Amino acid sequence: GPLGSELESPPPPYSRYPMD
Amino acid sequence: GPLGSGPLPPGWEIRNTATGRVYFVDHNNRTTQFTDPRLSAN
């Protein structure tokens, strides 16, 4: 069960500006 | 990483999570994604 997955979750919210 | 050297469509915009990780902001759907629509398109 080598369940390995990176990214696909960390991306901040829409909003408009760059906010983690 | 397999980034996308080119301007984003008429709605997407590049950004970063401060730490340094760059994400994509969709103004059409109003969401996000570390992925680049330029990479996976039709």
- State both tokens at A20: 């983690």
Concatenated DSSP letters of A1-20: ------SSS-----SSS---
Q: Tell me, yes or no, if A8 comes closer than 8 A to chain B by beta carbon.
A: yes
Backbone phi, psi, residue A7, to 5° = 60, -160
Q: Which has the closest alpha carbon to B22: B6, B34, B13, B39?
A: B34
Q: Domain map of chain B by residue range?
A: 8-42
**Protein fold of B8-42:** Ubiquitin Ligase Nedd4; Chain: W; (2.20.70)
DSSP readout, B1-42?
-----S---SSEEEEE-SSS-EEEEETTTTEEESS-TTTS--
| Sole residue written with tokens 């992925």 | B35
Q: Does A5 touch chain B (CB under 8 A)?
A: no
Residue B42: count other Cβ atoms within 10 Å of its Cβ: 2
The rounded distance, in Å, linking the Cα atoms of B9 and B26 is: 9
